[PDB]
């Protein structure tokens, strides 16, 4: 739970909240 | 604008600066220099607000570029009004030096005016100049 929340927060920060595609 | 103004020194200042630039670009248009001198005198008489010192410096610079006939040094005759010699006090050394360089009458008039109004602004410098001239000319 805590690990999943931390990972989700990190991914949201990295992707700018879904505005950026880093996987292409 | 000068045809409509009453106490506008800015118009005189701008006209004088225009004529000064025109004389600078072409160093043979003495009438422009004379008009600039007259306009500077008018603006200085109109200001009386510590902004006349730059105009006085420009007038002194213009006076030293005159010819034998003294064409430039005629705005004084073409200008009517008072002088307000208080704003010329900072330039006493230049007037003292210039009273032996090609324009003695014009600076002597101002120095005589100062001698009757602010004697303590002029006494020491005049005394030193007199001693220096006496030593040099007739040692």
């Amino acid at each position: 739970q805590y690990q999943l929340a931390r990972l989700h927060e990190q991914l949201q920060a990295a992707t700018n909240g879904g505005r950026t595609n880093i996987f292409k | 604008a000068l045809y409509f103004d009453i106490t506008a020194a800015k118009a005189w200042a701008e006209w004088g600066y225009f004529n000064d630039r025109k004389f600078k670009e072409n160093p043979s248009d003495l009438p422009s220099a004379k008009q600039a001198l007259t306009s500077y005198l008018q603006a200085a008489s109109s200001y009386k607000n510590h902004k006349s010192r730059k105009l006085i410096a420009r007038i002194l610079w213009l006076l030293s570029l005159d010819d034998a006939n003294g064409t430039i040094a005629a705005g004084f005759d073409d200008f009517k009004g008072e002088i307000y010699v208080w704003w010329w006090i900072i330039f006493i050394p230049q007037l003292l030096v210039g009273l032996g360089y090609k324009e003695a009458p014009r600076v002597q008039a101002i120095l005589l005016k100062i001698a009757k109004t602010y004697p303590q602004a002029l006494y020491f410098l005049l005394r030193t100049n007199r001693e220096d001239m006496l030593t040099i000319k007739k040692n």
Binding site: - | H50, R53, W86, I89, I90, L99, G100, A104, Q108, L111, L112, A115, K116, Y118, P119, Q120, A121, L122, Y123, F124, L126, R127, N129, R130, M133, L134, K137
Partner: protein, 186 residues
């Protein structure tokens, strides 16, 4: 006309108006000029320092003259002998003559002796009683005893017309000279 004629005309116009003020200013200037000139010791110190500095500058500009065999070139002998002759009190002239006017010294000895004389004069000037009474600089103390009581008009403190102001109604007037004078060596 000659500049001095115009200067005299200006001075005459200035004197015809404000006669008492002109008289007061002239008297004050004359007293300052008369009673505030250097004594002979300070003149000797000043000239010694000037000569030493000139010698050092010459040696710097033209090296190889600092050896113990170069005989005082540049014809400074004329300056040295003139200074020894007509610019010294009788009390120290024989010693300066015996030290310099002789052909003995080279540049090395020249600079050595100049340094010794400079040290002597510095030490002498440093041990005076610096605060001197003002009444000692006169025969009847015009500046101290009587300035406030033998002036015919008010005089401003000099130097206030060099500033950028719009009126002189608030200029400071001289009230008094303080009775103590400092002696300062640069």
């Amino acid at each position: 006309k000659p500049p001095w004629e115009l200067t005299e005309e200006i001075m005459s116009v200035l004197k015809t108006a404000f006669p008492l003020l002109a008289l007061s200013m002239e008297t004050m200037v004359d007293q300052i000029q008369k009673h505030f000139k250097c004594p002979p010791d300070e003149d000797a110190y000043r000239l010694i320092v000037a000569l030493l500095n000139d010698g050092l500058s010459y040696v710097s500009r033209m090296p190889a003259s600092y050896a113990k065999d170069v005989k005082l070139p540049a014809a400074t002998e004329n300056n040295i002998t003139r200074f020894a002759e007509t610019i010294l009190p009788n009390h120290i002239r024989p010693t300066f003559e015996a030290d310099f006017v002789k052909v003995k010294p080279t540049m090395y000895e020249y600079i050595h002796n100049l340094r010794k004389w400079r040290d002597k004069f510095e030490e002498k000037l440093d041990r005076r009683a610096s605060p001197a009474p003002l009444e000692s600089f006169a025969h009847y103390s015009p500046h101290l005893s009587e300035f406030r009581y033998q002036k015919f008009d008010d005089v401003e403190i000099p130097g206030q017309y060099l500033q950028h102001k719009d009126k002189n109604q608030d200029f400071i007037r001289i009230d008094r000279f303080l009775p103590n004078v400092d002696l300062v060596r640069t």
